[PDB]
Each structure stands twice: as C-alpha cells, then as structure tokens.
C-alpha cells in the first residue's frame, strides 16, 4: 500500500527532470509536500507549482528548469541534536557549500543552515542539491 507520499513525489520529479521534461503531476497532496516545494522554490530549483482541488486526493503541477541533481527522503525520522548536524552534512551532501538538508522542528520546517543559526535541533525530513 501507499505510505510515503513525499518519496513518490520526489522520485517522479527526478524521473521527469532526467529526460528534460517541463511539467510533472504528483497525485496526492499534503502540507509537508507543499512546504518542501516552497523551500525548493525559494532556493531556486523548481520555479512555480499549482495545487488542484478535487475534494479527495488533491493533485499538484510543478514546472521544472533543470538545476536539480538529486532529491530524497529519510524514512525513519531521526532526532538530530543541534550539535550533531555536521556529521550528517558530511555523510549526505557532496560539499559543505551548496547542499540543503530539511528538518522539522517546533519552530517549523527549515534548513540546516537556519537551524545552526538558531542553535536548535529536531527531526530530519530529506535533502536536495
């Protein structure tokens, strides 16, 4: 059965971008998907997207512009301490200069840079670069 909606969305996005497509459709919508996409948009990877209402299982449309090279999720939400972020950054990211790691906190969904700025920790959602 379906479980991780975000994983399916990200796999579809990467698949489409691989063959240089321009638009994608991901079937189930969710708040977490929306925040993930908003962060991606603010960082400049996926431009604009739209949410289509149908009362059940809202669909989404996203517009691509290359740029993105990889995206993923970490299924079991591990609890990163505030001072334990560097190890995950080194393990997961190609370099310590341009990748982004997403965390969910009591202060909301933000990036690892922002969490380091506020010296707080939380749970990990995913990554993109």
């Amino acid at each position: 059965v379906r479980i991780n909606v975000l994983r399916d969305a990200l796999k579809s996005i990467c698949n489409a971008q691989r063959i240089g497509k321009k638009q994608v459709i991901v079937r189930p919508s969710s708040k977490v998907i929306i925040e993930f996409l908003q962060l991606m948009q603010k960082n400049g990877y996926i431009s604009d997207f739209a949410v289509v209402d149908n009362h059940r299982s809202n669909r989404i449309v996203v517009n691509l512009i290359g740029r993105l090279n990889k995206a993923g999720v970490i299924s079991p939400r591990f609890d990163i301490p505030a001072n334990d972020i560097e190890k995950w950054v080194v393990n997961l990211l190609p370099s310590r200069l341009f990748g982004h790691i997403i965390l969910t906190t009591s202060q909301g969904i933000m990036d690892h840079i922002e969490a380091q700025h506020r010296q707080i920790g939380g749970k990990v959602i995913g990554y993109f670069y």
Binding site: Q23, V52, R56, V61
Partner: protein, 70 residues
C-alpha cells in the same frame, strides 16, 4: 503548445474517468417521449405513466429501449 493545467476538453474525454485531472462521471440523464427523465445506464426496470410494460432492456453498458419511445 500544451499545458497540463488547461487540458484540451476533447483529449480529456478519451481518458479514463479516474486518471483525469478531475475525477467525474461518464453518465448523464436524458428525456424520453412515448416525457420523463431516465438514467443513461439504467439497470433496473422502468415504466411509463401509461405503458403497461417495460421500456428498458438492461445491457452491460448503456441501456436500450423499445424504439417506440423517442
């Protein structure tokens, strides 16, 4: 040339009703004159105010009529 947000209405008619951008029925209501509304995919028997018998022939898909009705 093509945008996924505003599909051509016709290419949408050729797709499955659940895979469409918005799920919707394939069925409709219609009038009959032997002067009442009848379901397109009727399965149970139907009768007129006057007709003493049936005016429906259930099938796999769309119902058939007795042709006397127009």
């Amino acid at each position: 040339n093509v945008d996924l947000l505003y599909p051509d209405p016709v290419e949408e008619q050729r797709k499955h009703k659940l895979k469409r951008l918005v799920q919707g029925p394939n069925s409709y209501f219609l009038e009959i004159k032997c002067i009442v509304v009848v379901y397109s995919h009727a399965n149970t028997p139907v009768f007129c105010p006057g007709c003493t018998s049936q005016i429906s022939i259930p099938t796999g898909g769309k119902c058939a009529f007795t042709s006397q009705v127009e």
